Amino acid sequence: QPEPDMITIFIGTWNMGNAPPPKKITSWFLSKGQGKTRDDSADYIPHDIYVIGTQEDPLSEKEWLEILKHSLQEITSVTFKTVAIHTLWNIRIVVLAKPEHENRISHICTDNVKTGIANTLGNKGAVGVSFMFNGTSLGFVNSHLTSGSEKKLRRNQNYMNILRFLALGDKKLSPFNITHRFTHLFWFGDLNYRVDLPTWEAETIIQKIKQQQYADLLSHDQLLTERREQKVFLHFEEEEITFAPTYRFERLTRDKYAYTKQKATGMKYNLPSWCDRVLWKSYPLVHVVCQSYGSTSDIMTSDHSPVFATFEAGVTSQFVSKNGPGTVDSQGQIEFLRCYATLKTKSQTKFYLEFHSSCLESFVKSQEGENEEGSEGELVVKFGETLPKLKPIISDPEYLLDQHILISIKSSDSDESYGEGCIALRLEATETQLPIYTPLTHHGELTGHFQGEIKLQTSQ
């Protein structure tokens, strides 16, 4: 039975509005309703992995697991295995996988982050799950961010706290946050970004939604505008939105948006908004294709509609050779030529690099680079031809060209990372000097760039 080179992943996010679900929710897992929907001819084909994020979830873990498993069994005739479940307050993540994957999944991690301080600590935050699927690392984050149209900057802060403090994936990757730890990272939830138009325009917005004319609404969506201005979710991707706003509905119909200020809303307007979102970030040149992104039309117990997204995702096998794992393969090497980091920092410490990758036995520290002043005020750290030759555990090009090198640039004075990035080994050629590039981030904000050339030797 061959190991897969691609899997499909279902991502669901639903703010349940503290109400139990209706008796049938299969439309969610079938990607049917509005937006980019799944073809009817696929209905019986199970996804490999289902990741369900809920917010304002009133159910016990047992109660929800029973509903989810019975839903999937009805659709697929498959009894899914529970990989992980984790709840913070009323924020929950469930991961289910086909039974055939049970011995492909390992290193399962769960964690949560509570956002805010005092007043603002006690119901918002995030849960997450990570695991290895054969040779591929997968991370999943369900976040319920701060509500309210005038709190976009709080949501951006909540994002920054979650990616700093959520402890998922390989703890040996100590310089790297969750935005670098995984081959594929999916981040979803009630992100709570709103359509920023005047309150007086509520009925105009409603009109536009009835005409399925979303363009003048999406141009005011705070998540799209904040992302464009690099304030949040830097280096993530979202599929184009082609479904109606998923909030705020009157319960038990989808015919009415309930936007007016009420005592129950703290006298806040809730103009129709795309609160409920799915974004992802995959390592460079790894296959990932969104095959659905939409909302259900027939699940009406909440003031939010469920959102679904599905993905094709490239995966790799747990590679064994005669040599690695447990030794190097002398037929393999990675060389970095003419490399330099450009950093936005005002500081004047020396810097060194760390190279981290599961193709190495352990991470590799470089010598200090040579600081120069850039023409436009920047710090340029030159490494020249000084960088250590990296010795991969396996030299087979079928393995090595699928790998990635994480890079951290660290202060010699503090050993703190000033920037993290990632280089693919999926090169156009081997034994050939080729340009490489990554942006560098720290706490998920842009701090610089790393560029130079690579020369990869494989056994072929």
Ligand X SMILES: O=C(c1ccco1)N1CCN(C(=O)C2CC2)CC1
Which residues of this chain interact with ligand X, rule CB under 6 A? 237-238, 240
Q: Look-up: residue for tokens 């129950």?
A: 264
CB of 281 to ligand X, least distance (A): 10
* Residue number with CB closer to ligand X (238 or 420): 238
Element (H, E) at 61: helix 61-76
* Dist. CA 407–CA 194, nearest whole Å: 36
Largest CA distance in the chain: 70
CB of 294 to ligand X, least distance (A): 14
Closest-by-Cβ residue to ligand X is: 240
* Residue number with CB closer to ligand X (63 or 240): 240
CB of 230 to ligand X, least distance (A): 12
| β-bridge partners, 435 | 453
The size of the chain, in residues, is: 460
CB of 374 to ligand X, least distance (A): 27
* Residue number with CB closer to ligand X (232 or 359): 232
CB of 238 to ligand X, least distance (A): 4
* Dist. CA 22–CA 313, nearest whole Å: 31
* Residue number with CB closer to ligand X (203 or 237): 237
Side-chain-side CA neighbours of 204 within 13 Å: the count stands at: 8
| Best CA proximity match to 75, nearest among 15, 28, 14 | 28
Residue 276: strand, helix, or coil: strand
Q: Provide the token pair at 261.
A: 């200020």
* Residue number with CB closer to ligand X (182 or 336): 182
CB of 235 to ligand X, least distance (A): 8
* Residue number with CB closer to ligand X (226 or 238): 238
CB 340 within 8 A of CB 370: no
* Dist. CA 94–CA 235, nearest whole Å: 25
